[PDB]
């Protein structure tokens with residue numbers, strides 16, 4: 230097995246600046262080269278490291294021949310620097326953003342938000358990580374050697390053509406069910422191996438698929454200790470056998486490396502349309518962990534962090550967000566999937582470019598749907614009632630609290646700081662507060678993070 234690639238950990242320079250270059254290059258997957266896109270390289274991106282309380286300016290060079298934008302997913306920053314569809318960086322052009330980091334330690338990420346093209350641009354290879362540190366987290370004595378016992382794990386599926394090129398399409402099928410493929414990548418490599426010191430291994434898991442939800446576990450069933458969610462540390466570890474992760478979500482887990490025997494991180498079959506076609510109809514390796522006897526001192530604390538109380542609910546503004554799909558989209562998509570894949574496509578279970586909607590509207594860039602309060606908790610009620618698709622619903626500008634998730638109180642490891650909530654044929658409720666402003670010219674997005682739904686209308690803008 231190839232060794233797991235580790236995103237460079239990119240800090241500020243003497244002038245408090247970080248340079249990102251967006252560009253095309255070449256990658257090799259199982260023998261055949263593909264044109265890929267990357268930040269500061271051919272594929273994927275670095276891990277931009279930020280400290281709570283410190284400004285940094287990011288200089289962003291668009292070295293594509295097409296428009297793109299750069300969105301910091303998870304960051305509580307003004308709309309100006311949020312990099313939603315209105316933050317065009319022109320091909321050949323340079324844009325600079327000041328990020329004033331004021332939130333708990335967390336693993337966030339970044340990726341394009343090009344209007345109507347976000348799915349293709351991620352599929353082409355564009356994604357990096359954001360490691361936010363603060364004063365609280367460095368006191369915990371967690372595994373902290375980057376790329377040794379503190380390892381980013383970005384999991385994505387891709388589909389490839391006969392010539393080896395990435396085979397991306399926004400069509401009637403993928404607009405309905407998402408883009409998914411048959412090859413799993415972990416930091417860009419097919420089934421890599423990571424060499425991990427005895428003791429505690431820390432993994433920062435990102436589900437960076439366009440459309441495929443995942444479910445982590447190990448091959449010998451050893452536990453994961455969940456220490457952190459999208460928006461950072463939990464109050465204390467949650468110990469699990471398996472860990473479902475939606476598109477765009479991050480969890481940090483600790484795994485015990487307690488003797489010399491190799492095991493795999495795997496992902497278990499999910500009940501989501503399309504996502505259990507072979508080879509994903511059985512447990513599927515993500516990466517091989519190979520124990521090694523070098524220095525490590527990282528520990529698992531009893532107690533991680535102190536989070537705020539849920540605010541009381543009386544008097545909060547409530548906003549209804551109904552997600553919906555043209556029924557014509559569902560049918561033709563369900564059909565195209567059966568024609569192409571046969572009966573396996575359903576295991577576990579006409580212009581489409583505006584067929585997906587929130588509150589009966591496809592995303593309009595020039596009409597924000599509302600102004601949200603600044604600095605005041607609101608309750609957003611997001612409903613997927615009336616359709617059968619999975620919608621990981623994500624809200625920019627914020628880390629929120631899930632009050633109920635698709636019909637139940639959140640699981641314990643999902644009850645902390647989140648920027649994504651599951652919506653799937655039921656209704657979810659989040660408590661949300663915006664500490665920063667967003668004008669109509671640079672509004673915040675709230676959207677399904679199944680990328681093809683987003684691209685085909687399941688997005689709204691809002692101001693603060």
Ligand SMILES: [Cu+2]
Pocket residue numbers: 300301302303623624625626
């Ligand atoms: Cu985001």
Ligand SMILES: [Cu+2]
Pocket residue numbers: 618619620621677678679682683687
């Ligand atoms: Cu969706």
Ligand code: NA
Pocket residue numbers: 248288
């Ligand atoms: Na520069």
Ligand code: NA
Pocket residue numbers: 451452484485
């Ligand atoms: Na253990």
